[PDB]
Amino acid sequence: SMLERTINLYPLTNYTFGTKEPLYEKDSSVAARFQRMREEFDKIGMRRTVEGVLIVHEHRLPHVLLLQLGTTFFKLPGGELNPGEDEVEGLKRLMTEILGRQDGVLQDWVIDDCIGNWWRPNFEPPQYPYIPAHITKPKEHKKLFLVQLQEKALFAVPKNYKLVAAPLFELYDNAPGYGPIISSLPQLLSRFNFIYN
Amino acid sequence: SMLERTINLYPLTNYTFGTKEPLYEKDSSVAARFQRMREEFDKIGMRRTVEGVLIVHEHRLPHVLLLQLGTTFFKLPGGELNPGEDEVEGLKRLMTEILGRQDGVLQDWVIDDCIGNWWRPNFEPPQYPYIPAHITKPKEHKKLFLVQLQEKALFAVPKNYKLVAAPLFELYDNAPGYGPIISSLPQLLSRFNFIYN
Numbered sequence: 456s457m458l459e460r461t462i463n464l465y466p467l468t469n470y471t472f473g474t475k476e477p478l479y480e481k482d483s484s485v486a487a488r489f490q491r492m493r494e495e496f497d498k499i500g501m502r503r504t505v506e507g508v509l510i511v512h513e514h515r516l517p518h519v520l521l522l523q524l525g526t527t528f529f530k531l532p533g534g535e536l537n538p539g540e541d542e543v544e545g546l547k548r549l550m551t552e553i554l555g556r557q558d559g560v561l562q563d564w565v566i567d568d569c570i571g572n573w574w575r576p577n578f579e580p581p582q583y584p585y586i587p588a589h590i591t592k593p594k595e596h597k598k599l600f601l602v603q604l605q606e607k608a609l610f611a612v613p614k615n616y617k618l619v620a621a622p623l624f625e626l627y628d629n630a631p632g633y634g635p636i637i638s639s640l641p642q643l644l645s646r647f648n649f650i651y652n
Numbered sequence: 653s654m655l656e657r658t659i660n661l662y663p664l665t666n667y668t669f670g671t672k673e674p675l676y677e678k679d680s681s682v683a684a685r686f687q688r689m690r691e692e693f694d695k696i697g698m699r700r701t702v703e704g705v706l707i708v709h710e711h712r713l714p715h716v717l718l719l720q721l722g723t724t725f726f727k728l729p730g731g732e733l734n735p736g737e738d739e740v741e742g743l744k745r746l747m748t749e750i751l752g753r754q755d756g757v758l759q760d761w762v763i764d765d766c767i768g769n770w771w772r773p774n775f776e777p778p779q780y781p782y783i784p785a786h787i788t789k790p791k792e793h794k795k796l797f798l799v800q801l802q803e804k805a806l807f808a809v810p811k812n813y814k815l816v817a818a819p820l821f822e823l824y825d826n827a828p829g830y831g832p833i834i835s836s837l838p839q840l841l842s843r844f845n846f847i848y849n
């Protein structure tokens with residue numbers, strides 16, 4: 456009857472958030488983003504993206520770590536796989552590029568849980584937790600993983616981003632604030648048995 | 653990198669839906685429902701409910717089996733645990749009481765996956781995928797499980813209910829139609845690798 460995965464959470468105060476050089480997005484606008492997605496689809500087919508959900512707590516209240524681009528969009532750490540790149544090795548690589556330390560000490564990323572899949576049917580913002588009817592060639596597949604943090608860590612945050620710890624209640628039914636993927640993390644995380652260390 | 657659970661789906665046409673006597677709810681109204689929840693909480697504490705998600709496909713399109721009370725509310729098969737009753741044995745018992753056969757041949761229910769948890773903080777309709785801030789005594793805890801169906805089965809549907817196969821697209825962002833638990837099943841099922849048999 457204990458069919459739940461057990462996940463260790465640690466206090467937000469256990470983690471050090473340092474700073475490093477800005478990390479710029481490839482796309483300077485929504486229009487460039489969809490143009491590049493069109494160009495690459497014609498060359499290498501469906502875009503494969505991976506995103507990490509990093510959880511902490513304070514006073515036993517779970518929080519998801521989000522990256523805010525200045526004061527604009529909230530994102531999960533992650534991004535685009537290269538062709539033939541393993542999803543888990545790829546998320547580890549991307550989380551090292553985003554939050555990895557300047558002193559080049561390796562973070563020990565632990566990734567043992569897929570928590571969802573989203574599909575983009577067109578070169579357009581809409582994404583669904585399934586392949587919609589009539590769609591044979593989705594343009595992007597996004598895969599979300601739970602990343603188990605160590606007890607303590609130093610994260611180097613690119614200077615153009617803020618690392619925010621968002622409580623689940625703030626995400627819940629807040630698609631306007633966070634969009635349909637981040638806003639459904641409370642439902643996606645509910646199956647986990649969190650230990651508040 | 654294959655961190656996904658693999659689930660066998662079978663065509664809706666593999667299953668026979670027979671009929672049996674009506675199965676009446678304990679509560680004749682919302683008001684009686686919340687009155688009984690109040691009375692039992694004072695005697696035995698938090699209500700523990702369990703619900704089964706049964707999935708089929710037709711032409712490779714996943715559908716969730718829902719029970720419609722005539723043409724009114726949609727529900728998952730499940731219900732209330734007795735005090736000290738195991739969650740999995742209890743869901744098996746409840747799914748036998750609801751969909752079990754008149755000839756008394758045993759369904760082989762397979763339950764290996766928790767897919768979420770919902771909490772009711774007050775004697776009121778609102779439910780959340782987490783324990784909200786300030787709430788120490790939640791009045792109900794609802795646990796959802798994925799039920800792996802056999803290749804073929806006969807289900808006896810109480811005559812006062814319709815068994816409907818709902819495609820994921822119909823549930824998605826449809827809280828008004830289905831409420832916050834059923835409407836978030838697409839997100840909760842996205843992590844599964846479905847095999848369309």
Ligand SMILES: C[C@]1(Cc2cn(-c3ccc(F)cc3)nn2)NC(=O)CC1=O
Pocket residue numbers: 478479480481482522523530531532533534535549552553616
């Ligand atoms: C996928 C990637 C590279 C990149 C940017 N970020 C990032 C930074 C902060 C954050 F919260 C989430 C993602 N991670 N990787 N994106 C591009 O625009 C080019 C490219 O390949």
Ligand SMILES: C[C@]1(Cc2cn(-c3ccc(F)cc3)nn2)NC(=O)CC1=O
Pocket residue numbers: 470471473556557558607608609
């Ligand atoms: C930031 C620092 C010094 C430092 C901090 N920590 C640490 C703290 C907390 C923790 F969890 C694990 C390590 N180690 N070294 N100075 C640099 O130039 C980079 C660098 O390393």
Ligand SMILES: C[C@]1(Cc2cn(-c3ccc(F)cc3)nn2)NC(=O)CC1=O
Pocket residue numbers: 675676677678679719720727728729730731732746749750813
């Ligand atoms: C939990 C239960 C018994 C019961 C009713 N149903 C049911 C039928 C169809 C359906 F779709 C979902 C649930 N299952 N069990 N409910 C009561 O009102 C008394 C009681 O103990």
Ligand SMILES: C[C@]1(Cc2cn(-c3ccc(F)cc3)nn2)NC(=O)CC1=O
Pocket residue numbers: 667668670753754755804805806
């Ligand atoms: C409904 C029926 C006859 C029947 C059908 N099946 C069957 C069909 C499909 C399947 F997947 C597994 C079994 N077996 N017996 N007559 C009664 O009085 C109850 C009863 O059993």
Ligand SMILES: [Zn+2]
Pocket residue numbers: 513514515
């Ligand atoms: Zn505390």
Ligand SMILES: [Zn+2]
Pocket residue numbers: 593596
């Ligand atoms: Zn895909």
Ligand SMILES: [Zn+2]
Pocket residue numbers: 710711712
């Ligand atoms: Zn077919």
Ligand SMILES: [Zn+2]
Pocket residue numbers: 790793
């Ligand atoms: Zn509880």
